[PDB]
Amino acid sequence: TLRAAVFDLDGVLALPAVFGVLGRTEEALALPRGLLNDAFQKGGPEGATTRLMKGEITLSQWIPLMEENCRKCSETAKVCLPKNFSIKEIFDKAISARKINRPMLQAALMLRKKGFTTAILTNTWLDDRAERDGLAQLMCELKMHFDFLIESCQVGMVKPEPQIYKFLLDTLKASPSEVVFLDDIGANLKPARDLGMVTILVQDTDTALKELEKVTGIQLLNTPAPLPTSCNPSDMSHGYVTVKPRVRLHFVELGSGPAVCLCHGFPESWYSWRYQIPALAQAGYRVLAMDMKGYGESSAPPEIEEYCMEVLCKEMVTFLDKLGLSQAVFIGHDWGGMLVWYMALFYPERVRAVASLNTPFIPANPNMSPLESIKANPVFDYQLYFQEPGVAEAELEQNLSRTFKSLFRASDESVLSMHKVCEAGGLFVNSPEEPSLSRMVTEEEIQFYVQQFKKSGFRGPLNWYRNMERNWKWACKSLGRKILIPALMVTAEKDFVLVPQMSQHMEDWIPHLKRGHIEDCGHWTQMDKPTEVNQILIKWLDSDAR
Amino acid sequence: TLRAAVFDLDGVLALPAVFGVLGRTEEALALPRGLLNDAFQKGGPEGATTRLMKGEITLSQWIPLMEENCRKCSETAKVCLPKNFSIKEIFDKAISARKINRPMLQAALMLRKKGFTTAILTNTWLDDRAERDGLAQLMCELKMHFDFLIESCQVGMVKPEPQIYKFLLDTLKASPSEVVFLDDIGANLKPARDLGMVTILVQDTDTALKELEKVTGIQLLNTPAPLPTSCNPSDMSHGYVTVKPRVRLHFVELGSGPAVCLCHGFPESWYSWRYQIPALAQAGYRVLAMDMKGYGESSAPPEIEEYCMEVLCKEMVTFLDKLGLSQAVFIGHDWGGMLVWYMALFYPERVRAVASLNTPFIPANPNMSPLESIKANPVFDYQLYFQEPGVAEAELEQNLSRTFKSLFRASDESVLSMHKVCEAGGLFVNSPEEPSLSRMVTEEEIQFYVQQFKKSGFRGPLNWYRNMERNWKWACKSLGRKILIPALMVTAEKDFVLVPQMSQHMEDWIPHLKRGHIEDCGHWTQMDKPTEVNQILIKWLDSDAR
Numbered sequence A, B: 001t002l003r004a005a006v007f008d009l010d011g012v013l014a015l016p017a018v019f020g021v022l023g024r025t026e027e028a029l030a031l032p033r034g035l036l037n038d039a040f041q042k043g044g045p046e047g048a049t050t051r052l053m054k055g056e057i058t059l060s061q062w063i064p065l066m067e068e069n070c071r072k073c074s075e076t077a078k079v080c081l082p083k084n085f086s087i088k089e090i091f092d093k094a095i096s097a098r099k100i101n102r103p104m105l106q107a108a109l110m111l112r113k114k115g116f117t118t119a120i121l122t123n124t125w126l127d128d129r130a131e132r133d134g135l136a137q138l139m140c141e142l143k144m145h146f147d148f149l150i151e152s153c154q155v156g157m158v159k160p161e162p163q164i165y166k167f168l169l170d171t172l173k174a175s176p177s178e179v180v181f182l183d184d185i186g187a188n189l190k191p192a193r194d195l196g197m198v199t200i201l202v203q204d205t206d207t208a209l210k211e212l213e214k215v216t217g218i219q220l221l222n223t224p225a226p227l228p229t230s231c232n233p234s235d236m237s238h239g240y241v242t243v244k245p246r247v248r249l250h251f252v253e254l255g256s257g258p259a260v261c262l263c264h265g266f267p268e269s270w271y272s273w274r275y276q277i278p279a280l281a282q283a284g285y286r287v288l289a290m291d292m293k294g295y296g297e298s299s300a301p302p303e304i305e306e307y308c309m310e311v312l313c314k315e316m317v318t319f320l321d322k323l324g325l326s327q328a329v330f331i332g333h334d335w336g337g338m339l340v341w342y343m344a345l346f347y348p349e350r351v352r353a354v355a356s357l358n359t360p361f362i363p364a365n366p367n368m369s370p371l372e373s374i375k376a377n378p379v380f381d382y383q384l385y386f387q388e389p390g391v392a393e394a395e396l397e398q399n400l401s402r403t404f405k406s407l408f409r410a411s412d413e414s415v416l417s418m419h420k421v422c423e424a425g426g427l428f429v430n431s432p433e434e435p436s437l438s439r440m441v442t443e444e445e446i447q448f449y450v451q452q453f454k455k456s457g458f459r460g461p462l463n464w465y466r467n468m469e470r471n472w473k474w475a476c477k478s479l480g481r482k483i484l485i486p487a488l489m490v491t492a493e494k495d496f497v498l499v500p501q502m503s504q505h506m507e508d509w510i511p512h513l514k515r516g517h518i519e520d521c522g523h524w525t526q527m528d529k530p531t532e533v534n535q536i537l538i539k540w541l542d543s544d545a546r
């Protein structure tokens, strides 16, 4: 009975296999058949390539030895290689051309999701080439999805030597009959079979996945489109910056490249961006996913004025100052989307680019009090319910699990009217005491939000809505400005509060505005449509954020 | 009696002044004298430039209005500007050419060091130009050194309006006679004088600094070369990554660009790099200054095996994995320098470049036990004293203040023999109970190390020396390798343990090795010679680390 799956790298998790490309080179070069593949394999266990794979020597040391094998193979062949022949060029090009076999990785992902222990077992080298980062990046992306990565050059043993298979078994804490072993090399597959392991010879991926599906009894082929990679909170780098004597800001950080500062809405967390963080880091960006002031591990002072846009924006500037960042791309959702527009208007020199999910940019009306403005729109009634200190805190804090379960739902499954909230006397007045679980979230994810909110509750978060007059007075100073830095407005078709139509006049104030639109998407954009959000943000970032 | 100093930005803290460059442009272009300076100043308080400086409009909105003023000034002048005339080009070029007036900043730094409250008061704009980052970076570098930064476009008032001076006074919490105000503009200087503030009209810096020195009674001109910027621990971004169930690694993070991972030695801290962190971040790098395992806020498990090089290196790889970093430049000192060479040998794909201060790279002798090797050199006797669990912990933990004060000393002032340590029965056996303070450190800095070491003591740190056999066996597997990635060896002339001569054969194993050498430098390289360390590292990083 299987509980472990082992995958080779070359020709299994990454395509294409070496022997094929060495073959391709022989042909492109009109060289005698198999000469390159032959010099590569020269001396077998005692040869230069085995020493490389065992970690005795580096890739740069192996290059001249492979060169010497090529000449000697050519000498016996009664052949002469040209004067433009480079092993370095051939190998640089081949390593660079090799990409993750996405459907193979998906099957490994599904197996692990079903409780399998997964591992990569590979005959690899110690790469010290000037271009080593390309391979480093590939191994980084691949390895995160597996329980174990066993590299021949690290353990000093190679396939097909029996000890590596015994090493693999000892690592897995499994007896061989509990293991599926996938390899594209028949010779490297035999020792695993000898031990009684289930083996799959990998030629074309589809056939290999059909065999894998049959042996495991788990659907791997033709499955629905998977969700993007999420975040395990305990596996993240957690950062903390004191922005002022009583205020510290917490954030989760992943990746390298231009800083992308993610600003959640109400009543959320850095964790609301769980589906965006790995994708954006994988796309070549340094992600800083904030716990906004009043939330999670960030400070939550009680004073209402601590949460006006002017103070919040000033603190975000100090946050960048303390981190040594002259700029960051600012991406916000809901209340975070509002902050992000104000960061663009007031601190454009610190904003590389600005993007908002659902939250439109609407200039302050200097001829109408913000309270009058909110009253004009029936859907903003919940904002009035939030005004009175203590009222919404008591309802929202009564049962945290009910709060997040009632709030976090797709457009298809709501239990909340958002209609005449004050008149009804609550957000959850006609809501079940034990709401069902939305298709959007797992119980574990609800529990994370529950645990986060146990620290400071809803006072600081609700305070974000309690500065309408102060925010209005400050926003009025920006009335003659326009947003001329790169900007993206992302609307959600089924957000019944932050309706797409509310963003319709944005081009009057952001003339070069770029747009994204998500169909059949509710208010909780990031978890509702993670794949689409990722696609829109990465595409916009690569074209406009540099 | 003075206690506050205020500096203008344009023509005071940054050079050169606008009126001069607008003048320069008129001349280069053969334009009627003062036309550009005139169109710039058009409409005075009611004009386009005042609105820009008050924050009513952005720089990109102001450009076409300045263009329209230029034409109208030319029309009256009976002049026609050419068809290649660009306000954007002129202003982009001028902003870019403007640099920090280093001697003015030094005087502001000295005044603040002497207890003055310092501030920058500037008539500036909201920059939304594609090239805004150049200015953002300059303001970031400048602002960190001051108590206050008052920007006209942020406060909605400009010099020479009296309210800005009253705003400045209210910010300073000072009466005008307590303030020196430096400005290059006579008109902007008068309101401050009217209030009774001490004023300095700034033309050439030297004369301005002579006047400043006279009025304050503090030496600002001809002073000794200052130390590089240090770190205030409470003002840093603190990061935490769990590398395994029982191990968490703490680090301080500053800057943007390629990741540079700083690895301290024994018995140190991330704080040992305090003089390097701001400089390296300012040089265009993302600094990650570690608390190595066993130190400060990082975990300190008791087991000896937790501190062998193999485990330490594996954890540093996981640290990069968890942060989403495919590579980092690794810079180490003492025990950190040793780890950094092993990172290069075992994980070259993860090492962008490698640099070591004092610690040479010496391949393991497979024919001699590491204990035999250590015994062969009299200076390594302290390492034998460190072998026995509990002995060195008791002496080093008896009085923390005495420990760091006795250890952290320049080559000129040592109290420690490091000679026949075991025979003497201790490191501090012939050392004063109340050591004097080294010229290298302040009492506050000693206290920081004291506080850090109160958490875990010396067990985990001393454990770094307790894996000689394990490290030797592992290092022997790398005997056929060479270091072919970019590498720097920095020797310290007066390090009497890690003597420069010990690094003499390094080129045999690192053929492309680059070098640095610091004269009159002891063991505590970073704090002994911070300016020289910074110069060597930045120069090497820019040429070899990208």
Ligand SMILES: Ic1ccc2[nH]ncc2c1
Pocket (backbone or CB within 6 Å): A266, A267, A418, A495, A496, A497, A498, A523
């Ligand atoms: I609180 C909150 C805010 C906006 C919303 N839009 N749709 C649901 C919903 C809940």
Ligand SMILES: Ic1ccc2[nH]ncc2c1
Pocket (backbone or CB within 6 Å): B266, B267, B418, B495, B496, B497, B498, B523
């Ligand atoms: I602990 C230690 C290690 C090396 C040294 N070199 N010079 C002083 C000194 C102290």
